[PDB]
Amino acid sequence: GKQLTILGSTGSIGCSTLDVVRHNPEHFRVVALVAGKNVTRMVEQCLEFSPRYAVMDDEASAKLLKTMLQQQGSRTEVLSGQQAACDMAALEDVDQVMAAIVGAAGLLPTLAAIRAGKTILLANKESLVTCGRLFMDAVKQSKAQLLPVDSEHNAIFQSLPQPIQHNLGYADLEQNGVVSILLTGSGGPFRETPLRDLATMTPDQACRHPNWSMGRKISVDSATMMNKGLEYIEARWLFNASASQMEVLIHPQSVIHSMVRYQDGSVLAQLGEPDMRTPIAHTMAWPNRVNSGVKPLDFCKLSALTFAAPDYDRYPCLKLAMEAFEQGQAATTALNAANEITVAAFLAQQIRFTDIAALNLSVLEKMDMREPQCVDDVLSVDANAREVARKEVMRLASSA
Amino acid sequence: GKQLTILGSTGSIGCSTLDVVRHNPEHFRVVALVAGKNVTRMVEQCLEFSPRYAVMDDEASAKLLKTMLQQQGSRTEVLSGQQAACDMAALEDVDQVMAAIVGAAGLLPTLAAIRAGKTILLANKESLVTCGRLFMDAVKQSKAQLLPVDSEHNAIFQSLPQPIQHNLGYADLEQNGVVSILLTGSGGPFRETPLRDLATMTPDQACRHPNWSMGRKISVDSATMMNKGLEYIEARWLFNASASQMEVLIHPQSVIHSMVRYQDGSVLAQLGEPDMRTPIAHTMAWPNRVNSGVKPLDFCKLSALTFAAPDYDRYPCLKLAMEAFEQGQAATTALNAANEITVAAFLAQQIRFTDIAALNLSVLEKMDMREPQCVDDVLSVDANAREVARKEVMRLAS
Ligand SMILES: NC(=O)C1=CN([C@@H]2O[C@H](COP(=O)(O)OP(=O)(O)OC[C@H]3O[C@@H](n4cnc5c(N)ncnc54)[C@H](OP(=O)(O)O)[C@@H]3O)[C@@H](O)[C@H]2O)C=CC1
Ligand SMILES: NC(=O)C1=CN([C@@H]2O[C@H](COP(=O)(O)OP(=O)(O)OC[C@H]3O[C@@H](n4cnc5c(N)ncnc54)[C@H](OP(=O)(O)O)[C@@H]3O)[C@@H](O)[C@H]2O)C=CC1
Ligand SMILES: O=P(O)(O)Cc1ccc2ccccc2n1
Ligand SMILES: O=P(O)(O)Cc1ccc2ccccc2n1
């Protein structure tokens, strides 16, 4: 039995991982569940999986959870707050930690798992978007195993050779026959929109993916290719890839999830249904395999597969992400933070669709921060970048 | 580096192998070259790669090679005949043997390499199409490592987990998370031809593949999907795959080379340019990589990738091969041999395009031979199958 901690058990990734546990009771035992405020979901999960521990970040949520579990005869011990959440990530008997908390709040619990030398099933975006140097340095020091859960990074990982898989972050691509990492993205709803029409796209239009049904913020990041820009940042950290070892391709059908190019001409790819239980089950069972509940991909029921090079005039956020990487973790943290603000402003109809890239750039230009040296420095860059972005939004929404 | 014997050095695969060595002179030493009758090409290869031995199967050819190397000042030792070729495959100091002799002549030298526990870069079709049971048994015994060179099988191998790659031929697919092997094929030039028109296709039409330029025999095998049927037979042996663990898919663009389906939903695939140096260089360098001279696949200059299920009314030879596998090595050997006869007859304008599958079936129906127990037994089945086929052709053309 692999013993697990699930950080962010009540969200989308957490629920999908619990479905894999559900399919494989003989392979995985839930030791600890951690969430924020979803008491109702958390009760159900505690009843089904009988974790030794459950933690809620919010103290009033933990209190309610403590009492309901007692009445429903649950023996799970209820804890509260961030220290408790990091402790679950570092439990002696825990083998793997599903790192699936959203936002900067995912940082310290994910780091706790890394410092404890655990296998980390990495979902939280902020980990490598904002703390990529700090976290890869930390995994190298503890020899923690990272296994990326994100569909694209997981596809890359599966398409990579065994010496890289087992030394992830540290191994040399070149020495292992790898010439580049091919990161694929859908191109969003506006792949073919006349460029001059982008300024007038509405929130509803940007969120109407042709081939996806997801939350508004991630849907906008798909439309700007900010989503791929952030995954570019993560992949360079995760896979130890230089700028010339990265290729971003638009692949509108999203059937190929990403690819790896080798020295002999070979390209290895992972394909599948768009269901997160595939990459989650891959990371949970690695180096073996487990049923995930995902139906086999039917090749006779596909759109024709196509590819194209991103136009940075169409996707300036993609180019900003790549440029941000070269400026360091202060810049990537600032871009991620500014983008949360400007995307929310766009969705609230305070700015135009094209003002996301323009204001993201303006924030980066106005920032003057030193390379972060610890998580606390990153949190400070993030706070400051948000304030700079909010003030840019207000300037635009008010004045000139 | 690695010491190589190249069986069939003067042919297409042999020449591509030597091009990989040309790109990687520090990683590969050519110890022995073995060929048939192509003395001119053989001299040039001995002068470039400085092997210790050169073998011509044909004795007149060996005598002529010796005279030319002498004139040219080379001290490469010249040998002749079948035992010599097997001896090269078995040399104590060699690491890898490129098995690229064409036809049943490739069998004994390939077996010699297997019995010697060598790493076998396997590119002879008869080895597994005709001798799959005998050769996989021999591989388990000697612990020889097979590395398939054929593009589809190599793509599958690249897409399989490490415990299968090591242990190739005896590993359990299901235990290693593999649901099935997805063997991809172009569908040939008549993929969209009305079925009514197949009976009147000419040899020049059958050989005119929209995306290929190969020899006539294999171009016809692509048109009938016999080529994929034979690869289906090899894949079942190579990958220890039952019928239910095999899927054949038409992929017209031939960009994906083949795939492997996994328990969690994942499908891994290998893609690349249509250039045999890629899989050759993969097998030579494994488990590492080398430069092959092949240019990087440009994803911005591709046709859209499509897939389709093969229709056995359009491709009866594919179904015959799948069925032949279940009947055993006598049936697979008979089919391969009959198909050589019928394709040649088609190309000679003695029979129609659709007679190839019809007479292939007819031969198998006529034959009941028992499972071969040794290479002599398969040679015997092969010889009898050809005679049945030639008579079927003569009857038809009569
Ligand atoms: N969704 C996807 O397909 C993918 C997402 N990702 C990344 O994975 C992460 C998780 O995504 P997803 O599951 O969709 O996000 P959700 O918003 O669905 O879930 C977030 C989880 O984090 C919990 N949480 C929030 N704040 C805290 C905190 N302070 N302490 C402890 N738990 C907290 C939430 O608890 P509660 O709800 O109870 O308040 C919830 O369980 C994100 O960073 C995302 O970018 C990566 C790859 C794919
Ligand atoms: N071509 C391809 O893309 C692929 C082919 N295959 C298979 O690989 C094998 C080789 O194919 P290919 O390279 O195309 O074939 P060729 O016909 O081009 O080459 C055959 C080689 O075998 C030699 N040969 C023939 N008879 C003997 C013999 N009795 N003893 C020693 N050598 C002999 C030839 O010598 P010589 O010319 O001097 O007389 C030549 O060097 C075949 O079984 C084929 O089906 C598999 C994967 C890919
Ligand atoms: O690749 P993107 O645009 O960043 C996000 C995205 C969009 C559509 C998708 C459709 C199926 C699967 C994954 C997808 N991912
Ligand atoms: O797949 P098939 O039809 O058996 C043989 C075939 C035909 C065309 C091809 C084009 C590019 C690469 C491989 C090919 N192979």
Swiss-Prot record, chain B:
Mutagenesis / variant outcome for changing H209Q? Increase in KM for substrate. Reduces activity 5000-fold
Summarize how pH affects activity.
Optimum pH is 7.0-8.5.
Pathway info: Isoprenoid biosynthesis; isopentenyl diphosphate biosynthesis via DXP pathway; isopentenyl diphosphate from 1-deoxy-D-xylulose 5-phosphate: step 1/6
Q: What molecular function terms (GO) are annotated for this protein?
A: 1-deoxy-D-xylulose-5-phosphate reductoisomerase activity; identical protein binding; manganese ion binding; NADPH binding
Q: State the free-text cofactor note.
A: Divalent cation. Prefers Mg(2+), Mn(2+) or Co(2+).
Residues that bind Mn(2+), according to the entry?
D150, E152, E231
Q: Pfam families annotated for this entry?
A: DXP_redisom_C (PF08436), DXP_reductoisom (PF02670), DXPR_C (PF13288)
Q: Which Gene3D superfamilies match?
A: 1.10.1740.10, NAD(P)-binding Rossmann-like Domain
Where, in this chain's numbering, is NADPH bound? T10, G11, S12, I13, G36, K37, N38, N124, E126, G215
How would you summarize the temperature dependence of activity?
A: Optimum temperature is 40-60 degrees Celsius.
The UniProt catalytic activity note for this protein reads: 2-C-methyl-D-erythritol 4-phosphate + NADP(+) = 1-deoxy-D-xylulose 5-phosphate + NADPH + H(+)
Q: Which cofactor does it need?
A: Mg(2+); Mn(2+); Co(2+)
Give the Enzyme Commission number: 1.1.1.267
Q: Which GO terms describe its cellular component?
A: Dxr protein complex
- Annotated binding of 1-deoxy-D-xylulose 5-phosphate, by residue: K125, S151, E152, S186, H209, S222, N227, K228, E231
Query: What is stated about the way this protein's activity is regulated?
Result: Inhibited by fosmidomycin.
Which range is the signal sequence, renumbered to this chain?
none
Q: What GO biological process terms are annotated to this protein in UniProt?
A: isopentenyl diphosphate biosynthetic process, methylerythritol 4-phosphate pathway; isopentenyl diphosphate biosynthetic process, methylerythritol 4-phosphate pathway involved in terpenoid biosynthetic process
- Return the InterPro entries for the record: DXP_reductoisomerase (IPR003821), DXP_reductoisomerase_C (IPR013644), DXP_reductoisomerase_N (IPR013512), DXPR_C (IPR026877), DXPR_C_sf (IPR036169), NAD(P)-bd_dom_sf (IPR036291)
Q: Give UniProt keywords alphabetically.
A: Cobalt, Isoprene biosynthesis, Magnesium, Manganese, Metal-binding, NADP, Oxidoreductase
Cell wall biogenesis/degradation as UniProt keyword: no
Effect recorded for H257Q: Strong increase in KM for substrate. Loss of activity
Concerning its family, UniProt says: Belongs to the DXR family.
What this chain does, per the entry, is described as: Catalyzes the NADPH-dependent rearrangement and reduction of 1-deoxy-D-xylulose-5-phosphate (DXP) to 2-C-methyl-D-erythritol 4-phosphate (MEP).
What is the protein name stated in its UniProt record? 1-deoxy-D-xylulose 5-phosphate reductoisomerase
Q: Tell me the organism.
A: Escherichia coli (strain K12)
